[PDB]
Design a protein around this ligand. Structure first.
Ligand SMILES: NC(=O)c1ccc[n+]([C@@H]2O[C@H](COP(=O)([O-])OP(=O)(O)OC[C@H]3O[C@@H](n4cnc5c(N)ncnc54)[C@H](O)[C@@H]3O)[C@@H](O)[C@H]2O)c1
Ligand SMILES: NC(=O)c1ccc[n+]([C@@H]2O[C@H](COP(=O)([O-])OP(=O)(O)OC[C@H]3O[C@@H](n4cnc5c(N)ncnc54)[C@H](O)[C@@H]3O)[C@@H](O)[C@H]2O)c1
Lengths: 200, 204
């Protein structure tokens, strides 16, 4: 699955950066916090091409999963909201190195429009969001606006032809395009549930 | 006699009860929960009997009572103490997140190794502390959750220090797998972008 494929990809990529050639299912099981039977079952999708002896060829799986995930493609991004989240994301320098290029950032606050959210990036007026998205063919919109305005902002991106939405606002966006939510509070909540379970 | 429902199904009830409240449902039946949670109606009644009559209203279950009683069991009414390690883009944005205290999470300290950042305000009322005192601060204040907002190359090191200081859990923003004896929730923005783009291409 997508989340599981990405999890394998991040692990194997760190493994290649270290320089490791072969990784065992048990090392994968520990690194991914998964069962060794599931590690072998998931990776059996790549057949004997993904294995070297008892272990797994790190570069083969990394290249094969990178192909599935389409990691060679670059993506145009816009960030709606020049607040805490929007600026932190816009200033993540290596994001462009991973193939995700933020080319526009928008906000409805006159004090911040015209300011520099990041080197080479100027906050634009959210009134020009649809025009900017259609003109530049932006594929992914990053919603860093409040939860009340999130559905509206999402509708604006969808009407303007956005292909996907990365949503930081704590609300279930109702829209046709794929949405990936980063809910920091919910992630903290999920963590607490596991904390309560272990200390019960 | 009536056993406490396991955490995994408590969480399932909680999220289902949350959706019901958003829909405006005040009373829900065992069969509706059986349908929405894919469980035996018999099992729904055995699980919810843990909350006695307090969980029930009329012909069904009191959604509000169950949401708050299950949330209480899951620590939703408990104000969790957080520290943030790393006072950069992520750490400052998390430290500046206004209403997180209202949601139940209070950052009482933020730490960094940069002497140019230490002693400045990461957020109004919050001073960047020297990461040298990280363990002592966590132990003294009984900090539960550590938010790792440092670069990946130092993330494992920070996690072990939090672990040694008795941290209960870790929210990790650094794109690495953390190996510690406490639970870890990863938030990987790049991974989330990769999931999103894969689903975009999948629809074609
Ligand atoms: N910062 C966190 O750690 C955190 C945690 C959990 C959730 N979130 C969610 O992430 C989102 C962003 O939070 P933040 O901390 O960056 O908020 P923030 O207040 O710092 O920034 C929000 C920005 O959105 C802008 N904005 C508001 N309405 C707009 C509109 N219609 N069009 C364009 N811009 C608009 C505001 O001017 C502001 O600059 C929020 O929805 C928040 O609930 C953030
Ligand atoms: N900003 C994003 O959008 C984004 C996206 C994906 C991942 N991340 C990950 O989140 C983490 C933080 O990102 P950021 O953009 O805030 O980075 P940043 O460089 O802005 O913050 C790093 C901070 O950590 C501090 N630090 C470094 N080593 C430390 C140590 N041993 N102890 C304490 N503090 C230390 C630095 O002084 C710096 O202030 C990184 O791991 C990054 O890869 C961030």
């Amino acid at each position: 699955v997508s989340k599981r494929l990405v999890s394998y990809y991040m692990c194997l990529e760190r493994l290649l950066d270290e320089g490791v050639e072969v990784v065992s299912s048990e090392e994968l099981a520990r690194r991914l916090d998964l069962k060794a039977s599931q590690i072998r079952k998931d990776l059996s999708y790549f057949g004997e091409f993904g294995k070297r002896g008892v272990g797994y060829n790190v570069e083969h799986l990394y290249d094969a999963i990178g192909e599935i995930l389409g990691v060679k493609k670059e993506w145009k991004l816009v960030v709606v909201g020049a607040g805490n989240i929007g600026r932190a994301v816009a200033n993540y320098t290596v994001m462009k190195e991973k193939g995700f290029r933020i080319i526009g950032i928008f906000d409805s606050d006159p004090s911040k429009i015209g300011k520099e959210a990041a080197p080479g990036l100027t906050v634009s007026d959210v009134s020009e969001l649809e025009k900017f998205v259609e003109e530049h063919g932006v594929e992914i919109g990053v919603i860093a606006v409040p939860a009340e305005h999130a559905q509206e902002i999402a509708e604006r991106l969808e009407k303007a032809g956005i292909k996907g939405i990365l949503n930081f606002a704590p609300v279930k966006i109702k829209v046709s395009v794929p949405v990936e939510n980063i809910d920091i509070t919910a992630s903290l909540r999920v963590l607490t549930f596991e904390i309560v379970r272990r200390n019960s």
